[PDB]
Amino acid sequence: KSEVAHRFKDLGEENFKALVLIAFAQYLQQCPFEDHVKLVNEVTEFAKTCVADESAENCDKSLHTLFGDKLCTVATLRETYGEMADCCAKQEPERNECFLQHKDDNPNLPRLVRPEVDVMCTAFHDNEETFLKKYLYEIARRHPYFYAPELLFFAKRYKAAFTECCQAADKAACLLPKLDELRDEGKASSAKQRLKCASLQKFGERAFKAWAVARLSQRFPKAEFAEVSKLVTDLTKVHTECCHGDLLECADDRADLAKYICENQDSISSKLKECCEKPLLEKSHCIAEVENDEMPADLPSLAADFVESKDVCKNYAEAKDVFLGMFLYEYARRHPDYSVVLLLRLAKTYETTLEKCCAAADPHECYAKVFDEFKPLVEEPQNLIKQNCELFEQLGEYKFQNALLVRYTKKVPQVSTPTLVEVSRNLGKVGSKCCKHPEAKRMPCAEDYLSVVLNQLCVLHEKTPVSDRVTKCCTESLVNRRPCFSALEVDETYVPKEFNAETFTFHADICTLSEKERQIKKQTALVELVKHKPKATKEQLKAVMDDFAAFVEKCCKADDKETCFAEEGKKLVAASQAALG
Ligand SMILES: CCCCCCCCCCCCCC(=O)O
Numbered sequence: 001k002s003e004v005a006h007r008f009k010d011l012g013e014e015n016f017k018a019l020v021l022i023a024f025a026q027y028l029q030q031c032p033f034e035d036h037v038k039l040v041n042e043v044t045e046f047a048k049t050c051v052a053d054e055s056a057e058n059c060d061k062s063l064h065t066l067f068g069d070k071l072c073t074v075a076t077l078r079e080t081y082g083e084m085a086d087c088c089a090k091q092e093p094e095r096n097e098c099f100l101q102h103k104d105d106n107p108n109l110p111r112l113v114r115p116e117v118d119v120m121c122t123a124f125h126d127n128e129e130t131f132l133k134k135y136l137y138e139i140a141r142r143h144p145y146f147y148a149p150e151l152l153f154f155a156k157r158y159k160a161a162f163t164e165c166c167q168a169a170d171k172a173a174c175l176l177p178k179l180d181e182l183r184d185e186g187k188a189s190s191a192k193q194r195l196k197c198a199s200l201q202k203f204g205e206r207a208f209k210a211w212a213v214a215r216l217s218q219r220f221p222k223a224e225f226a227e228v229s230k231l232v233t234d235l236t237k238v239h240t241e242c243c244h245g246d247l248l249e250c251a252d253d254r255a256d257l258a259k260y261i262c263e264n265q266d267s268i269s270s271k272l273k274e275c276c277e278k279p280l281l282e283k284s285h286c287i288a289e290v291e292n293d294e295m296p297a298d299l300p301s302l303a304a305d306f307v308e309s310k311d312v313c314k315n316y317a318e319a320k321d322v323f324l325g326m327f328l329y330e331y332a333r334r335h336p337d338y339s340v341v342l343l344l345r346l347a348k349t350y351e352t353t354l355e356k357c358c359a360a361a362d363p364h365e366c367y368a369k370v371f372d373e374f375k376p377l378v379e380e381p382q383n384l385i386k387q388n389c390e391l392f393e394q395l396g397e398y399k400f401q402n403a404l405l406v407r408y409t410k411k412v413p414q415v416s417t418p419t420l421v422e423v424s425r426n427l428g429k430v431g432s433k434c435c436k437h438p439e440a441k442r443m444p445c446a447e448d449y450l451s452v453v454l455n456q457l458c459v460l461h462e463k464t465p466v467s468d469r470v471t472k473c474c475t476e477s478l479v480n481r482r483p484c485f486s487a488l489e490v491d492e493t494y495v496p497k498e499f500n501a502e503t504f505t506f507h508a509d510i511c512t513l514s515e516k517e518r519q520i521k522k523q524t525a526l527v528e529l530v531k532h533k534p535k536a537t538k539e540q541l542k543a544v545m546d547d548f549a550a551f552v553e554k555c556c557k558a559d560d561k562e563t564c565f566a567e568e569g570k571k572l573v574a575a576s577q578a579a580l581g
């Protein structure tokens with residue numbers, strides 16, 4: 001009878017308020033914080049009214065209606081947001097749709113700066129609620145497409161870091177490494193979110209469904225293809241709605257399928273226990289990040305149903321996709337250690353083959369070498385992992401990063417130096433975060449990270465194209481979007497830059513800089529050094545890097561910094577210029 005009272009009761013006053021806040025923030029991104037805190041109170045006083053009497057006036061209205069109604073209460077709506085106020089003249093079906101429309105994705109607001117640990121902790125003390133609500137409001141208005149409940153999930157992890165660290169003697173050493181982790185986790189989570197909706201739009205349902213099938217069947221290797229199909233179907237509807245940006249429609253669609261999975265739990269996965277015992281607002285998130293189930297191990301084989309058994313072209317022509325979907329389902333679940341793309345890379349190969357064999361005299365003997373063709377497709381990413389995780393051990397994260405720097409700068413020297421550095425730094429991290437895992441969980445790991453990075457890297461070329469090559473892979477299918485980069489070859493067309501002493505003039509500042517800064521500084525010159533002399537051997541370059549490692553010491557450990565950087569520096573650039581000939 002009352003949508004509001006209902007949401008209140010199973011959500012709770014605490015979470016209800018937080019969400020209302022995030023909600024209004026994602027829409028009225030220009031209104032001040034103190035302004036929303038009022039709305040949230042206004043709205044919460046209301047809800048409480050319905051919980052007491054479901055019949056109380058307006059409690060019968062739909063949330064989409066009540067919401068829109070309040071939004072149109074903002075007097076400065078016309079002045080502040082303008083065009084968006086026009087929405088208030090249409091009635092509900094259109095109105096809400098009209099709001100989702102004029103919702104700015106990335107509004108021009110000032111970069112949020114992280115205050116001093118001590119000022120943070122102190123602010124967290126006098127008024128911890130308003131402290132978090134304000135930063136919640138700040139993050140919200142900056143990412144209006146971000147799933148509220150998930151945003152609320154990060155919020156609490158932040159309060160646990162402030163609760164724990166602001167009590168320690170060494171606050172900074174406690175707080176800082178967590179704030180860095182959370183930041184990088186929310187960034188990753190946001191990018192994937194914006195990444196999923198992009199794929200759904202560029203390649204469409206089929207590709208998305210294929211993807212989902214392989215991933216779903218990897219997690220639930222015991223569920224039957226029928227169930228997987230069901231879920232993959234419901235799933236895609238969810239992401240279509242959530243992408244569209246309607247909070248309520250997306251919140252319910254996710255709640256439903258979460259209930260369906262938990263009720264039919266025993267028919268899906270054994271590792272869904274906990275997730276199903278959690279509250280409404282967390283079940284979904286829980287399930288989505290759930291672990292793989294153990295595989296039947298009583299499994300037959302694939303060459304039996306997909307390479308041998310005549311009547312494959314019969315079963316294939318009857319329902320081309322379901323058949324292929326079965327292949328995936330079948331192959332995926334037997335390989336939780338492959339990357340989803342890898343699997344889609346195989347399914348496609350199979351599709352391609354079936355299409356060039358079911359149209360020949362004796363098909364049975366045309367596609368009997370297929371599996372043999374999966375071999376190279378599998379080993380490429382497998383070799384890449386070992387190779388790169390081996391090197392990451394031979395050198396630290398930092399020393400490893402420099403290897404990539406030199407490696408990629410050579411591929412696309414055209415790319416901006418500050419870009420090559422950042423990109424090269426993130427790749428190193430992916431390497432450290434994943435190489436820690438055993439062979440089994442490696443490939444899936446790399447895929448998770450490499451996916452966002454590669455996209456983030458592509459979105460830039462999107463605004464400032466530089467290389468036709470980087471542009472060729474960025475546009476290609478998500479399934480070829482990675483092996484393409486791995487295929488780039490050192491650019492021989494590139495014409496070396498000209499010397500600029502300034503770029504190789506290091507004044508005694510570096511001596512007093514944080515590791516983050518000392519590196520970025522050194523690394524930036526490294527890229528510049530390769531852009532200048534791109535034909536330097538891994539040998540020639542190692543040398544210059546050595547004569548520079550010592551140099552830094554000899555001048556930031558000597559009684560006359562500044563003189564050492566100018567006198568000794570002239571010797572490096574000179575000697576170096578000559579070494580690299
Ligand atoms: C034209 C030659 C000028 C020499 C410029 C040297 C730039 C090398 C920076 C590389 C620093 C490597 C990092 C490190 O050693 O810790």
Ligand SMILES: O=C(O)c1cc(I)cc(I)c1I
Nearest residue numbers: 139143146182183186187190
């Ligand atoms: O700017 C971002 O990329 C971003 C996104 C989310 I969602 C959470 C957090 I913290 C951040 I720093």
Ligand SMILES: O=C(O)c1cc(I)cc(I)c1I
Nearest residue numbers: 216254257258284287288289
């Ligand atoms: O997209 C997901 O990560 C996902 C997966 C399953 I399985 C169930 C639900 I609800 C979700 I939101």
